[PDB]
Design a protein around this nucleic acid. Structure first.
Ligand SMILES: [Mg+2]
Ligand SMILES: [Mg+2]
Ligand SMILES: [Mg+2]
Ligand SMILES: [Mg+2]
Ligand SMILES: [Zn+2]
Length: 229
RNA sequence: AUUCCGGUUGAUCCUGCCGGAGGCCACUGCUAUGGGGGUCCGACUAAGCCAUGCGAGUCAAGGGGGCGUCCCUUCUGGGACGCC
């Protein structure tokens, strides 16, 4: 944590904002990550996340989900292009997913990491399993669903210490968001990695669309964003 | 662990089947130091055919006999005892 404080301080001083939200962050009128959500702002400068969530630059908080090469046909042969699917998170409450293209692998990786920061979202965590009622944010608070392409994903709460009972892509994405235990069910073509990742991402996002009462927050130990001990 | 991964195109998304990865049972290649426990070993084809030995006896306190050893007298005998 000590490295990232000074890293954010270094980034803040030499950064020239170009947008309104960047100006708000630069002048110190916005000081917390949670204050840029749920008000319709547009996020176009990656430095905002670097200042407010510096730990997404750690090597352990980034994941290269997949790499593919695609071909365009021309009378002078085949033109090759790289597509990279990547994800980032702070392992507490925030996660982002991105896609980048480039003529060579390094450019595509850089752009994919860059776009993941701009698509960052915050989720809700809790414990809602029938056989584990512990009020601790180690799983999803209730059953959620998502879909993309032909892939349908359903996430079910699990007991503490169970593990992530899901394919590897889902494992990585859920780990980056700070979830330890879950059950799952799927339909469709999971071997299409992009759609699988997007479906898991949408299922995580849909935790904000479920109406809840103040009693439920106490009952399931629902936490929004950072756990904040 | 309420799970996926490879395969149809110059490249993409689907439907759909094949293969991989797990457990148990029967036969089998190569190779093997020790102990304990258990309801394991000619069932699948032939409920096909069988040399040899064994796998159902017991009762002397139900009854007349045979044989043997002893005691009493014994010509003769009567007892007791033990086998058949
Ligand atoms: Mg031409
Ligand atoms: Mg759609
Ligand atoms: Mg075809
Ligand atoms: Mg026979
Ligand atoms: Zn729990």
């Amino acid at each position: 944590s000590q490295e990232w404080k000074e890293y954010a301080k270094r980034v803040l001083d030499e950064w020239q904002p170009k947008t309104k939200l960047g100006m708000l962050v630069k002048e110190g009128q916005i000081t917390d990550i949670h204050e840029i959500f749920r008000k319709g702002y547009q996020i176009k400068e990656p430095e905002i996340i670097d200042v407010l969530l510096p730990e997404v630059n750690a090597r352990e908080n980034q994941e290269i989900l997949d790499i593919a090469l695609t071909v365009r046909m021309t009378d002078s042969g085949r033109r090759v292009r790289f597509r990279v699917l990547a994800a980032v998170g702070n392992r507490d409450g925030y996660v982002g997913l991105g896609i980048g293209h480039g003529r060579e692998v390094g450019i595509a990786i850089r752009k994919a990491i860059n776009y993941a920061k701009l698509n960052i979202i915050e989720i809700k965590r809790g414990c809602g399993s029938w056989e584990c009622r512990c009020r601790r944010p180690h799983s999803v608070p209730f059953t959620v669903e998502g879909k993309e392409g032909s892939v349908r994903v359903k996430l079910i709460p699990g007991p503490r210490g169970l593990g992530l009972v899901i394919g590897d892509v889902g494992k990585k994405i859920l780990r980056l968001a700070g979830i330890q235990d879950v059950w799952s069910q799927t339909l469709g073509e999971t071997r299409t990695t992009v759609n699988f990742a997007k479906a898991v991402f949408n299922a995580l996002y849909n935790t904000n669309k479920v109406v809840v009462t103040p009693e439920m927050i106490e009952r399931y130990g629902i936490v929004v964003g950072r756990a904040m001990p």
